[model samples]
Target: SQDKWELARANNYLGLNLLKQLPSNDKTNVFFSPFSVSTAMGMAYAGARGDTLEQLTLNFGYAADELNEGKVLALFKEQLQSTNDLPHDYTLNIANAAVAQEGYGILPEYTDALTSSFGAEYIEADFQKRGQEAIQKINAWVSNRTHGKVQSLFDEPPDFSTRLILLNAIYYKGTWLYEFDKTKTKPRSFYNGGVEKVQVPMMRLKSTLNHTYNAILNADLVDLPYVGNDFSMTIILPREKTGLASLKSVLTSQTLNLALQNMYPKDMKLKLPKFKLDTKYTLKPTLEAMGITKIFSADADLSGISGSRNLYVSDVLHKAVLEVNEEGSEAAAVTGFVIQLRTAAFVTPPPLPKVYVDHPFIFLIRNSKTNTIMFLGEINAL
Candidate 1:
């Protein structure tokens, strides 16, 4: 059990490390779901073979033999169950599916592996005969599963020659433990740059909450619990005005655990901007840069997903959206592994400390019960 816990932490760490390598532009607010991506990749990892499998385990920060597919599957199912009604009666839907070309003839054992390992369902669509319909059909599921937050996974029809697609989509909406009063929300100054500021709506609240100030990382942490008390949106504020990048540099699984373990309950005041974020990414370049190039080339080894070597990943696209306001938070993400062939607490004891997240910061939406991080983000220019 302890070893499994370590594997989970290793996965989280690798996800953040990938974030560190993600290209950043100072003027844009960036967000992605490491949990979503990794979970989907785990499915792909189940079907990987030869050097392809090695790259995944190595790059994902785990020993090849350290992870067992069945064990990972059990853990995945547990994570799914834990998040279903987490925190304050929040709504979270984690769904995964594999779409195969009508005549591609993927092995039943491989499809069954996905189903058993990740609860991934299967669909057969004739990509060559009715391409647009196939795209709409999959997007329809993505739309419904994400509660319409991610309306479509593909704008154009997938290549008719495509052999397979593996998809993961999630939807989350939570009512805050202490909802902000809309009447109190007002225009506030947000730092855009030196001597450049803009007025935006800021939601305010005061409550007893569990928090910590990390002198080591020069950051402050706050927990915004959702219904059910099993999940929350934790924000990390870097004290250095534009120091988000600096904070990102030292964000390891070890540091994250220490930060949480060291937190204390206290009465605090908080002000957070009410903002919405929408992001779209084509992740092949990112994945390739991260040492997963073989999957996209003809040399890819994904025979475990199919009986033959006729399949290789062609593309991967992901979309994410987040809405934060007085009502609480609503967020969703869609990840299309376009496999052409492959793919806490409260206390009111001490002096009031304040956590005003009016500037850029890092945030995570996670499941406290199971230590699963569902999403990680950076709010830089918003």
Candidate 2:
């Protein structure tokens, strides 16, 4: 049970690392879902622990491709140097293109390590023992890297019958860098759909904030920075009662970021819902719909992995999970992050605008170190 719990915690840490890279405004009432991350991690474990070249290539490619989107792969590599403390051989290969489309090319830095680690002779051996050992090593590495926050998700090597798996974990802890006075957190009625109402924890503040305002089709956009202006939270309150639905229909990375640029601060009373939500996703179909197909198919090509021309992917699994609450937000995602907060203050800090976030809105937690988006989510009701 301790091992299982630790594994869950490890998953949560990984997911949260990704969430920290997301643009703040993109996360309204939504949670980071890490089902995809778990799946890919499991596949990586399976591939590292398996016997056959086919099985290893298939699972390895699946893990590499699923986790290597946008800037996440680079971020993860950086994290490895800092997070991975185990003195063992570990190599991470990120796909340069979709497996099917571009032949499963890998980052040059990671290519040689992977090839040297798992050669043809190693695959031909009695790999069950090797698989078990590899799984244990990885589990140990993960456990140590997270300072025991994550433990044994893979106690044993996966079986051949295991087609897919999903894992989800959550961590939420923070007293605002500037604690919101309890007296300021007042009770408020939040309207979700006009007819429905719920009592919620609303944190109110009137401090000068780095803010921007934008106009969108259905709602007005507002951006507010946290302690370090590098990361921010965005809110889009609809002009119409039913504007949320239309906004969701058109939600995309481009639209979301554009709205943040539109924010300009004016005098405002902010009443934000103090609430938490966590969710997990099995992104097989969702990713396929998003145009990631070849890596999950048996006919997918992954030749660059082992210098072998016959390798093809057999499966691709992905897991994502997220949680948000009053104190702060934590997520375990396989996505990306960046660290450092730069403000206009350095160039020409504008006058701090007074504002309050009193209702349902979106938020993000980012790592200024890597410049990768870690979380993207929204809050609808308290």
Candidate 3:
């Protein structure tokens, strides 16, 4: 159970680190679910063996000893169980499944781990012949889970070379514990960069909230809880208009914890812009950059998935959708490990403890109890 907490922290750290790796400047908004990313890869890791597994173990921040001890898998199970068992007042769905090429024998040990730990379902598809149908089936699965927020996960099938595809999706529709007033929302100028400003619908809220001023980040951090109180959004707004880049430079897993640890309750006036974002990523390059190279290459040893070393990852694809408004936040993310493949913040306060998010800032949807981030992103221009 301790490993569950540790894995939660590790997930948050990876979320931020990957946000930093994303190719986004001050003028662009970026969003993705590191939780979804890891879940898919973790499922693949269930089928991973040898140096391929070692690379994933390192990439996931799990020590070799922990990997050997089965602690990582235990944490994965706990993470999934909690998310799936959330209160019904708001919608939170986590779905995982695998579609493998028909007639290709898959090891039960691999499938068993995914089913037992990730609750992943198994299906058979003929990637060699019915590739188009296979794509539609997988896309339909993703669409249904995400409430149609993510329609197309795979535009093109993995050709004949593909053997297996692993999927992980999370759909969250939450009501804020303290909702913002729609009447107070107005068009406001959001400072993007040097003299560049964009008009946005900014929502204002005045409440006694939890917040903190972190000197290390030179930013303000605040927590906005969802209806169930188990989930919340944390925003980190930098002190200066042009300080976003510098704040990102000094950000690290250690500094992030330090900032969150310093937070306390206070009276606050917050201004946050309502925005909608849809983004997609082919994470093969990024995962390779993060030192998870073997899984995507011919040298990969994914013997556990099949009985031989014939299967390797071809791609890792991800898509995320976010809508933050006066009512609440609706976010969905889907990540798929195309076995032809491999891949893969905050701040402070002001007057009445005012935290005006009128510029680029980091935000994360986190589970309070697990202390793990579900969705992580930054809004730069809007």
Candidate 4:
């Protein structure tokens, strides 16, 4: 069995890796669900072979020895099962699905693994004739899974070359354990990377919360637990007004784990801005840059999923939405792996230590018990 903490650590590493490669511009707000991305990719991995499998395994931060041994997949299965087994007080759901072109020859083993291991729902669509309908079905499935937080996953219908799309959607809605008073919410100046100053709603809360300070990041870490206490939002605010760049540069799984390890309860006056982010990312180039290129090229070997070598990934699409206010936080994210045939398929802390987040900062909503990072993003501007 794969250890949950190890899987969580891998999830964190993958999150940091993507963050390092994302847009560094000051105005761009970044957000994604590493859990959703990894889970979708994991479904693809179920059918991967040789180099493609190895690349997926490595990119996911699993030990090389685990490859070809079913150990890596076992870890994925363990995580999925545990997630379903965890008790819930809030609305948190992850849905995995496989939408394949009707009559496409996908190996039974692949579909079975997806169904039994990840609990993915399988659907058939005729991309060649009913592309628009297929698109609507996929979008509706995603919308329903996300409680309408994410409505349209695909802007265009799949082309004839499209053979399959593996999707993962995660949604969570919960109120904060210590809700910020709406009366205290007021317009405050927010610095965008030490440059432009914009007025935004700042939600204020004074409570003893779990928090800490990190010298390496020159930042404060604050943990905001939700109603269930199992999950929380942790924010890392760079102490220096323009320190976001430096903070981004030094953030890694190691440093992040270190920063969060010693969090202590402190009386803190928190001034967190009310912000909502809707971000979309086409992850093909990013995944290729991260060293998983064969899957996108003709040389890819996904025969395990199809029993043939004609499959390759065309694109990977991810969309995420996050809304944080005085009442609480609601987040939803989805990742779809477009697998084609030769063409289709493939926080914080504290004080009285007044941790006023008046500038750019990074935040994570995670399952503290499993150590899984459900959503991660940075608010660089208003």
lDDT of each: 0.73, 0.40, 0.77, 0.77
Model 4: per-residue Cα lDDT over 202-320, one tens digit each: 99887777898999988999999987687899999988888887898999888888989989886667898988777877787887777878777878787887688766776677777
Q: Answer with 2 or 4, whichever has the higher lDDT.
A: 4
lDDT (Cα) of model 1: 0.73
Cα-based TM-score, every candidate: 0.86, 0.53, 0.88, 0.86
The TM-score, computed over Cα atoms with residue i paired to residue i, of candidate 1 is 0.86
Model 2 accuracy (lDDT, Cα): 0.40
The number of the candidate with the highest lDDT is: 4
lDDT of 3 by residue, 133-158 (tens): 99898888888877777777787877
Candidate 1: tens digits of C-alpha lDDT, residues 1-382: 6755765685677578768877777677777777777766776787788888888888866677877867776776666555553544565565677677876557787777666656676778888889989988888887777777777777888887777666766655668767788888999877753124778889888776778988766899988887556667889998887877788888888788889888776667789888877776777788787787877787878888777676777666666666777884432122222234332344344455688886778888876665667777887666
Query: How far off is model 3, as Cα RMSD?
Result: 11.1
- Give me candidate 3's TM-score against the actual structure: 0.88
What value does the lDDT take at residue 108 in candidate 2? 45
lDDT of 2 by residue, 114-150 (tens): 2332110111111234556645654554455334544
Candidate 4 residues lying further than 4 Å off, grouped into runs, are: 60-71, 85-89, 328-351
Worst 10 residues of 3 by lDDT: 330-339
- The alpha-carbon deviation from the true structure for residue 244 of candidate 4, after best TM-score superposition, in angstroms, is 1.2
Q: What is the lDDT of residue 377 in candidate 1?
A: 81
CA RMSD of all predictions: 10.8, 13.3, 11.1, 12.7
